[PDB]
Structure formats: C-alpha cells, structure tokens
Amino acid sequence: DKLYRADSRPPDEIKQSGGLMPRGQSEYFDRGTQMNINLYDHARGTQTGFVRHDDGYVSTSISLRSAHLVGQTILSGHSTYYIYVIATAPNMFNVNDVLGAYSPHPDDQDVSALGGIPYSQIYGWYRVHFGVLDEQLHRNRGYRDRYYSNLDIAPAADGYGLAGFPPEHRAWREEPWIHHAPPGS
Amino acid sequence: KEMRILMLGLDAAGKTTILYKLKLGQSVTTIPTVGFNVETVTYKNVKFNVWDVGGQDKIRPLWRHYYTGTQGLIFVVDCADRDRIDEARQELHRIINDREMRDAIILIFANKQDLPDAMKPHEIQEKLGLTRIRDRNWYVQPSCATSGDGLYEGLTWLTSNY
Ligand SMILES: NC(=O)c1ccc[n+]([C@@H]2O[C@H](COP(=O)([O-])OP(=O)(O)OC[C@H]3O[C@@H](n4cnc5c(N)ncnc54)[C@H](O)[C@@H]3O)[C@@H](O)[C@H]2O)c1
Ligand SMILES: Nc1nc2c(ncn2[C@@H]2O[C@H](COP(=O)(O)OP(=O)(O)OP(=O)(O)O)[C@@H](O)[C@H]2O)c(=O)[nH]1
Ligand SMILES: [Mg+2]
Numbered sequence: 001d002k003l004y005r006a007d008s009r010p011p012d013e014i015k016q017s018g019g020l021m022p023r024g025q026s027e028y029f030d031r032g033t034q035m036n037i038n039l040y041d042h043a044r045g046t047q048t049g050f051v052r053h054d055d056g057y058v059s060t061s062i063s064l065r066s067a068h069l070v071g072q073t074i075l076s077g078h079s080t081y082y083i084y085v086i087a088t089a090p091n092m093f094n095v096n097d098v099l100g101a102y103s104p105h106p107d108d109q110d111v112s113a114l115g116g117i118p119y120s121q122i123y124g125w126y127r128v129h130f131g132v133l134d135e136q137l138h139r140n141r142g143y144r145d146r147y148y149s150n151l152d153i154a155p156a157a158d159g160y161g162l163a164g165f166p167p168e169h170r171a172w173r174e175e176p177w178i179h180h181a182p183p184g185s
Numbered sequence: 186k187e188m189r190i191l192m193l194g195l196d197a198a199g200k201t202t203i204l205y206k207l208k209l210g211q212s213v214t215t216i217p218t219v220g221f222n223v224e225t226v227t228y229k230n231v232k233f234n235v236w237d238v239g240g241q242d243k244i245r246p247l248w249r250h251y252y253t254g255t256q257g258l259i260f261v262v263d264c265a266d267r268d269r270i271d272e273a274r275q276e277l278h279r280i281i282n283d284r285e286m287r288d289a290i291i292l293i294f295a296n297k298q299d300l301p302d303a304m305k306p307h308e309i310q311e312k313l314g315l316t317r318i319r320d321r322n323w324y325v326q327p328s329c330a331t332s333g334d335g336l337y338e339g340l341t342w343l344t345s346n347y
C-alpha cells in the first residue's frame with residue numbers, strides 16, 4: 001500500500017537531496033546537533049506549536065485525500081506543491097498507534113518515517129496547482145519496487161520504545177510503555 | 186544473479202561508511218543512522234542489494250522487520266571497542282536465531298583494523314562465539330572501511346559461499 005506526503009519542494013530538489021530527509025539531518029551536519037527521535041516530541045512539536053529543527057521524523061498521510069487537506073492547510077501559501085506517493089518500509093510508524101491515547105494531535109493521522117524516506121522509496125508524485133489535483137501521477141523512474149514490496153510499516157509494538165514521552169509523563173507507568181520506561185518514570 | 190544483503194551491527198561500527206565506500210568509491214562523513222540506507226552495488230557480475238540499518242539500542246527492535254528475503258548477513262563490529270564486543274555478541278546471536286534468518290550466510294567485518302588497540306579476527310571470532318554457529322557458513326573478514334581494505338574480499342566471500 002502507499003503513503004502520501006504533501007511537500008512544497010519539487011521532485012528535482014528531492015532527487016538531489018537523496019529523498020525526503022528529516023529537518024534534524026541538516027541541523028546535524030550544520031552544527032553537530034543530535035536528531036530528536038522521540039515520537040512524542042515530533043507530534044507535540046515546539047512549545048509555540050511548530051516543527052522542531054532537530055526532528056528526526058518525516059510526516060506522511062495514509063490517504064491522498066488527507067495529504068491534500070494537509071497541503072491546503074500547511075501549504076496554502078504555495079501556488080504549486082507536490083504530493084509524493086511513497087511505499088511502506090519498517091522505519092515508518094503510525095503515530096496514533098505508538099502514542100495511543102496520549103497522541104497530542106490525533107487528527108494529524110500521521111504515519112512518520114524515522115530518518116526520512118529515500119528517493120528509491122518514492123513511487124511518484126501528483127502536482128497540485130492553486131489547490132487542485134488536475135494532473136495524473138508522474139512516475140518516479142528511480143523507484144525500486146522490489147526493495148519495498150515485501151516490507152511493511154513497523155508494527156506499533158516495536159515503536160513503543162521510541163514514544164519518548166517526557167520522563168515524568170504518566171504513560172511510562174502504564175502498558176505498553178512501562179516496559180521501555182527510563183529510570184525513575 | 187542477485188543477492189539481498191542485510192548489514193547490521195552496533196552503532197559506530199562502520200556500516201554506513203562501508204555502504205558508501207562500496208557505492209561511491211569514496212569515504213563520506215556520516216550521520217548516525219536511525220532508519221536505513223539502501224543501495225545496489227554490482228561486483229564480479231553480482232548485483233548486491235545492501236541494506237544498512239541503524240544500530241543504536243532504541244531501534245534494534247526494528248532489525249527483524251528487514252529479515253525477510255535476506256540471503257547474506259553482514260555483521261560489522263568495531264574492533265577497537267572492547268567495552269562493547271560482548272553486547273555485539275548478544276545482538277548477533279539474537280539475529281541468527283530468528284527463523285527468518287536461518288538460511289542467511291554471515292560475513293563479519295572485523296572493522297577498524299587500522300586502530301592501535303584493534304582486536305584481530307581470531308579474537309573477534311572467539312569474542313563473538315561464532316563456533317557455536319554450526320548450521321550455516323560464516324567468515325571473519327578484517328577491514329578498514331575508510332580505506333576500503335577488506336571490503337571486496339568480504340563481497341567475494343559472499344558470492345563464493347552462497
Ligand atoms: N506533509 C504531510 O503530508 C503530512 C502528513 C500527515 C500529517 N502531517 C502533519 O502536518 C504538520 C506539518 O507537517 P509537515 O510534515 O508539512 O512539516 P514539515 O516541516 O516537514 O514541512 C513543511 C515544509 O518545510 C519544508 N521542509 C520539510 N522538511 C525539510 C527539509 N528536511 N529540508 C528543507 N525543507 C524542508 C518543505 O517546504 C515542507 O513542505 C504536522 O502536524 C504533521 O503531523 C503532515
Ligand atoms: N578508524 C576507523 N574509523 C572508521 C572505520 N570505519 C568507519 N569508521 C568511523 O567510525 C564512525 C562511525 O561510522 P559509521 O559508518 O557512521 O558507523 P555506523 O555503524 O553506520 O553507525 P549507526 O548508523 O549508528 O548504526 C565514523 O567516524 C567513521 O568514519 C575504520 O575502518 N577505521
Ligand atoms: Mg549508519
């Protein structure tokens with residue numbers, strides 16, 4: 001099956017970046033900062049509500065309709081943007097399944113890729129112009145189906161250890177996160 | 186002929202360096218891998234599909250979700266890192282005892298042989314308990330990923346031995 005990510009960067013820029021990379025990756029090469037791979041921080045974002053510069057995850061949607069709704073919210077100011085169609089692989093996590101009822105913004109319905117999404121994993125893309133999907137999918141000639149056809153997103157059980165709730169958060173005293181609790185939580 | 190390769194090991198072992206030394210011929214500056222990298226490399230008429238999966242402790246539970254279809258395991262060890270060789274042993278044996286990995290041959294890169302304190306292959310073989318592995322072929326290949334020494338010999342072993 002496929003995932004969908006709205007993004008304002010064109011396909012040529014994505015290709016030259018090696019794919020859809022997390023913000024934290026640029027931060028690391030730019031100033032040594034270690035990427036934040038706490039799924040809760042990614043979902044919560046910054047105090048002010050924005051995406052963290054050290055984020056180690058890249059967000060995707062589970063439907064084309066959801067990705068388009070995101071594009072018409074987040075990317076409303078771009079007269080052109082793209083929806084990237086993406087195969088499933090085990091660095092992907094369903095945020096609401098991993099954070100459970102503690103997911104801070106469950107309406108996001110986010111499936112997030114830890115460490116980003118290589119170009120070979122991108123099946124193709126839809127161009128969106130003034131908010132309209134008028135064009136057929138453009139296929140990525142760099143896509144490699146055999147890499148991904150046999151792989152799935154990670155199951156939530158193997159995501160629990162990455163939930164990364166803050167140390168005093170009550171989730172760490174409950175199933176399932178208690179089995180990954182840091183000391184004292 | 187094609188070979189699906191899973192490259193595993195602890196963080197800082199040299200996996201991503203190996204992948205890019207093989208694919209680009211060059212030594213790259215890396216970032217710790219938290220998801221995966223994947224490239225396809227052609228050598229002595231074999232297409233090697235090599236998966237470089239992140240080795241930090243928190244993301245080791247994800248390793249098994251890559252096991253499917255794997256024909257060779259490349260396990261990379263930092264031979265200067267005596268403090269973690271035993272943890273490396275425990276992670277290796279956890280991999281090879283998964284049912285989906287039963288028929289994968291195992292190449293050990295005994296990496297960072299350039300470093301002064303470096304454990305040599307005899308020592309690595311013994312500290313990894315490899316002679317308890319009796320159901321498939323394995324081999325310890327000394328390497329320095331940064332200089333590329335040992336890598337194509339490892340790849341040769343994989344072809345010869347599958
Ligand atoms: N983008 C989606 O399709 C998507 C899918 C599901 C949920 N969400 C939700 O939407 C909100 C925002 O997510 P988002 O993923 O758009 O934010 P984001 O920061 O990743 O993307 C916003 C824009 O920033 C730029 N950008 C992103 N990563 C970059 C990088 N590594 N280098 C340079 N520029 C980069 C691009 O122009 C991109 O469109 C979050 O709440 C998330 O849960 C988004
Ligand atoms: N001295 C020496 N350093 C090496 C050698 N191979 C890799 N390194 C270095 O060791 C560090 C870690 O290398 P990586 O390739 O990122 O290791 P990694 O196994 O991919 O780590 P994870 O992505 O966390 O799983 C880097 O500084 C490399 O330059 C080697 O043969 N000799
Ligand atoms: Mg790496």
Ligand code: NA
Binds near residue numbers: 001087150151152153
């Ligand atoms: Na898949």
